[PDB]
């Protein structure tokens, strides 16, 4: 099994750097050498996740200054949403730097996502390109690929594209509005987002996603049918077993509750919620009477979690709940026998981590294409969790709608609660099956070696 030299070149977002680095650890585990291209200051945030420093080498780059970007801005963590397009422009301006690095390091394959110009660069040097995408393949499979004679409408998305392996996915009016307006989004250097991604899909040597044949397989196959080129699966990318210790504040606090009784809620941990929603969420948790630990950033216009909390809250939940604005070991809290519920924002890494533990799944998707599709996949197709309901037009939850979803899954007599737990258990048993993750990756590496 000959050894590969891959370069990893993900979009300037921790949500993309981090999954690329986990995958880099799986590949390095098999002897493959990785050059991991990363914004230079961001590298310090990621070095500790490198579990193969001998084989995984960081290649720090300057993220160029663009007018409008704050000083030293590197990733989407440094700017509001309205400025992501300038991060994309900055990334486009690194091409000549990348070409130097590719000429001297000479990897055999480059993994990329948003760099539509990357396939021509690598092809010109005899280097293969894999567009490694962080979304679930169901997201491009369902949201693209309709007949194009007129602009796509909200009503068009209410039906699946022709040949889509499955029935129509439910989409609320607010989500439909968001989805249609996203098709027009300009993202860096004046390129339409959709053109940026589709150029990469077409000119790469292969497209790849996280996933396994039993769940993501049909969507990969469908896409391979639409574009007539390889769409690979890299495996479920399960968390590596890390011999670590949970923070004593939590091993104590969590240990003082009956097993399976605590609600962990990571909603609002990636991006600050608007104040109205932060309150309804926290009030939502308290109104379930269950123990809860809410890991989230302070809301917009607020610098601390304590300065945000509604007056009276901290008293009324003294024993029951905790609202904690500091860094948490989420994988490890979920591995605690006391946690029984998981409120996820439905990012791909969050979904995998909830799936491989025993907690019930509550799905509160943060507005986004892959987030919405994940929540629908989890709650209406695989039926492994319950969604929090939102206003049909305004997309907001309430303390009541938050309370219902966790009460449904936390009621051992509710028939939906029993159903989602059993389907969850089924998916967990597959993902942790003995051969699943390891043969996925070996097969992936066979397919990578087949591109040479």
Author numbering: 3 to 454
Task: Quote the passages of the study that discuss this structure, keeping the authors' original sentences.
In order to dissect the mechanisms, we obtained the apo crystal structure of GuApiGT with a resolution of 2.2 Å. Due to the low amino acid sequence identity with reported structures, the structure of GuApiGT was solved by molecular replacement with the help of AlphaFold2 simulation. The crystal contains two highly similar molecules with a root mean square deviation (RMSD) of 1.1 Å, and adopts a canonical GT-B fold consisting of two Rossmann-like β/α/β domains that face each other and are separated by a deep cleft. The N-terminal domain (NTD, residues 1-242 and 436-454) and the C-terminal domain (CTD, residues 243-435) are responsible primarily for sugar acceptor and sugar donor binding, respectively. Based on the structures of GgCGT/UDP-Glc, GgCGT/UDP-Gal, and UGT89C1/UDP-Rha, we simulated the UDP-Api binding pocket of GuApiGT. It is noteworthy that a part of UDP-sugar binding region of GuApiGT is different from that of GgCGT (glucosyltransferase), SbCGTb (arabinosyltransferase), or UGT89C1 (rhamnosyltransferase). Moreover, the plant secondary product glycosyltransferase box (PSPG box) of GuApiGT contains 45 amino acids due to the additional S371 residue. Representative snapshots of GuApiGT/UDP-Api/2 complex model indicate that D372, H373, and I136 could form hydrogen bonds with the apiose OH group. Moreover, R368 could change its initial state, and the side chain could flip into the pocket to form π-π/cation-π interactions and hydrogen bonds with H373, and hydrogen bonds with UDP. We propose that the additional S371 residue could increase flexibility of the loop, thus enables R368 to interact with H373 for the binding of UDP-Api.
In plant biosynthesis, the formation of glycosidic bond is usually catalyzed by uridine diphosphate-dependent glycosyltransferases (UGTs). In this work, we report an efficient phenolic apiosyltransferase GuApiGT from G. uralensis, and dissect mechanisms for its sugar donor selectivity towards UDP-Api through crystal structure analysis, theoretical calculations, and mutagenesis. GuApiGT could efficiently and regio-selectively catalyze 2″-O-apiosylation of flavonoid glycosides, and showed strict sugar donor selectivity towards UDP-Api. This selectivity was highly related with the unique 45-amino acid PSPG box and the key RLGSDH sugar binding motif. Through theoretical calculations and rational design, we altered the sugar donor selectivity of GuApiGT and Sb3GT1.
